[PDB]
Amino acid sequence: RRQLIRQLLERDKTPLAILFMAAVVGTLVGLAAVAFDKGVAWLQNQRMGALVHTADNYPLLLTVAFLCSAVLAMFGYFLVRKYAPEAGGSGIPEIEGALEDQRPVRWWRVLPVKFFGGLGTLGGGMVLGRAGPTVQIGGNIGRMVLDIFRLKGDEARHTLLATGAAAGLAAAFNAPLAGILFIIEEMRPQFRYTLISIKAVFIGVIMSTIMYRIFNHEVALIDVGKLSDAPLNTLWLYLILGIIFGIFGPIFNKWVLGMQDLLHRVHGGNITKWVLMGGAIGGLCGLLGFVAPATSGGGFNLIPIATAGNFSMGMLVFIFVARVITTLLCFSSGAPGGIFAPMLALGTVLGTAFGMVAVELFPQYHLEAGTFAIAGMGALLAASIRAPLTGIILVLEMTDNYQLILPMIITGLGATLLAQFTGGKPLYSAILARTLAKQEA
Amino acid sequence: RRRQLIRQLLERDKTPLAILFMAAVVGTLVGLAAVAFDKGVAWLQNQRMGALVHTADNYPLLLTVAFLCSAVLAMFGYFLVRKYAPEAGGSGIPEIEGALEDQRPVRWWRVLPVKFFGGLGTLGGGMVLGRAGPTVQIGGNIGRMVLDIFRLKGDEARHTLLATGAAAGLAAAFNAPLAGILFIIEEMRPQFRYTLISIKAVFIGVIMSTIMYRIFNHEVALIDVGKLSDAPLNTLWLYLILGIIFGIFGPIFNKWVLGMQDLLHRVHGGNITKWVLMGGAIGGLCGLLGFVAPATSGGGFNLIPIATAGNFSMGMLVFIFVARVITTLLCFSSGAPGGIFAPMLALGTVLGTAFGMVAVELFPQYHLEAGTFAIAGMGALLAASIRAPLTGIILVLEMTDNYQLILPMIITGLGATLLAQFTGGKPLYSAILARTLAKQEAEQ
């Protein structure tokens, strides 16, 4: 007891050196994030101009569309397989491992690998997000200054590694709160105590977000507008949607896991078969990005369009199925790039679908399908990743429809609850487990 | 420990179904309890206002029933605590924070009626105290109650249901679900070791509690500030400065609330009669001040939209601040059942607006709106004194709904916490639990 009375009076006294270093980590992760974003944009831009250069010969234009992405994909898979294999896929499981001191942070390798590697896969127009990449990059950034300035202690190692990962998500979504929440709900060691200074994570998230604001102000990633409210007697519809995501989550979770295996056979581990396959998948996305751009790319483009209800039911069913396919294909191939953001697009689409059915069945509720999209936007994040609080706060930060907080929380729970009751597991912890097991086998 | 991890990771987030169900029950009860408490405080505040109309001619007689009506209700509040549940005085958050460390008991059979009816007098009498603390402690005891009744066993169920109760309590007191859940994971839970508090279950309780509050209190917001203006990047440095100002004031305010507890303890020495009488004096003063200068008494929620809108003068802002600091310390450091959480929102809003006003005149090139500095500083005392910025920031965001000010709010909040640390300040809630834990061994 007297230990506590001594501990309480000493509470929240983070070492000033940690606080200062947190500020520099966040700043670097910020600029890094901004540069990554501007980079991906530029390559997506040139590819678009290349199709204009040949905007008459359809079979030819269908080729440079394929090749330009196929090449950039290959350059991505290659940079990973050759210099940093831990820089493939998401990057979040790896950093989550780092916090458990069960994986290494080879920043001298992963930073240029993840940055330029993702720069090719993303810039090529594959179904992957900036989320994971920037989170991993940020963690390595944090590890970098730790080494350079030679800060010692478990606290400094865990903290700077955390403020880096947090500041990374924040700069990739312009979502400060969501970044901080990710670390304390998901990223940090889930089964034991740790010395991660929250105050320091904050200092990093600010500076990172600030940097992002210096370069990307005036425009939002997702503008949905201010939608209608949700009557109390309409809330049960949100629980049902949550239950639908709740059973689909685990199923989607097996698919991403299983497809990693099936795609691993195609190359067996060989750097050449793999990279070549990467160009096949990546090249497919560049082609799909011209013949049906809704089935390829980040997916952020069709969120506002879905929410406004500008899609038909068929197009929604199409976009969903098509994106499930191209998401598994891209992420379970080992390419540098996350699944986080493309699940936002997947959730938004499924929600709008549910909302549309809801509108016709209940004209007495005066429904707007867009409200079920916003509820379901972070529902796949809740059912598959199993971090609902972060997903809910994230969507709130991006869509700014706070008057829908109750639907968003209820759908989010109905996902997480049924995800558990159907044997699903946190994807990020299921991957780190898969990786930690192949390590001791 | 690699192999335990692969085992643990695959077993992650599988909260026992019994705990998940009971979380829903706890939340619902905490909701109804909160709603009842709110409706009760309103009714008594209402009757007192009607009594002043009954004698709205004789000012000296008017100034008396204004005193007595609050003095009586205060005494009835101080009395219910001292006689039946001494741990139900003051905030209530330090005590529940103690419960999660298993260092304090949860005597729900006593505190529930004591805190409910006791605070119902102090708040309903119009003292400068909040629903926050009371509902949080009440909620925690509600949680412990169903734990005992249904005889759930295990550290996990104890800590969890005790936590979903405290969370659903803050949520129903502010109509702030996110802020309630965040409070548990940023502040409430044991800060120095591991614990088995299912977040998913805290959520289930927070939902149900907030839903219950929504059944009875829809259509109206506690704080309507409207959609203010945005904040340019070149204006951000002003928010860090405001944060630093709160940063040095927090710890100072922290000493005052602590020290005033001591100074007021001498006036009664521990005696139930001197204390209750002194409670009537303080409580009666608030009922009087509630008629002659209602801005210096009461919960304070009323003058937040007024301050933000810029409808006060700099003099009135200076008056309201000093006066409310005085009546806040007087009410909370007296041991009355009622928190300091909400009155610190009012104090923060006023100080922010004050800063905003000076900021507007000094910089017309920024095209400033003083209300943006109020919203920034609204959860800043919460950040500098309580040292839970993330909760305060999200809380204010939930109440004021001005998300386009998230950066100023975060930055001011940090400057508070950073300078609160660097000036030797301590978390108020932890500094009270320590004072209580120490006295519990001092008399041994």
Oligomer: homodimer
Cα-to-Cα separation, first versus last residue of chain A: 44 Å
- Our estimate of the beta-strand percent of chain A is under 5%
CATH class of chain A: Mainly Alpha
Structural class of chain A: mainly alpha
InterPro entries (chain A): Cl-channel_ClcA, Cl-channel_core, ClC
Subcellular location (chain A): Cell inner membrane
Family (chain A): Belongs to the chloride channel (TC 2.A.49) family. ClcA subfamily.
Subunit structure (chain A): Homodimer.
Polypeptide structure, described:
The structure is a homodimer. Chain A has 441 residues and is an all-alpha fold. Chain A has a single domain, classed as Clc chloride channel (Orthogonal Bundle), CATH 1.10.3080.10. Chain A is 72% helix and 0% strand. Chain A has 19 helices and no strands. The first copy, chain A, has helices at 2-9, 16-53, 58-83, 92-99, 107-124, 131-148, 154-173, 176-187, 198-216, 236-267, 271-291, 303-307, 313-331, 340-361, 370-375, 380-383, 388-399, 405-420, 427-439. In chain A, helix 7 (154-173) crosses helix 8. The longest helix of chain A has 38 residues, at 16-53. At the A-B interface, helix 1, helix 8, helix 9, helix 17 and helix 18 of A face helix 1, helix 8, helix 9, helix 17 and helix 18 of B.
Question: In terms of topology, how is this protein built?
Answer:
Two copies of one chain form a homodimer.
Chain A: H1 2-9, H2 16-53, H3 58-83, H4 92-99, H5 107-124, H6 131-148, H7 154-173, H8 176-187, H9 198-216, H10 236-267, H11 271-291, H12 303-307, H13 313-331, H14 340-361, H15 370-375, H16 380-383, H17 388-399, H18 405-420, H19 427-439
Helix pairs in contact in A: 2-3, 2-5, 2-6, 2-7, 2-9, 3-5, 3-11, 4-7, 4-19, 5-6, 6-7, 7-8, 7-9, 8-9, 8-17, 10-13, 10-18, 13-14, 17-18
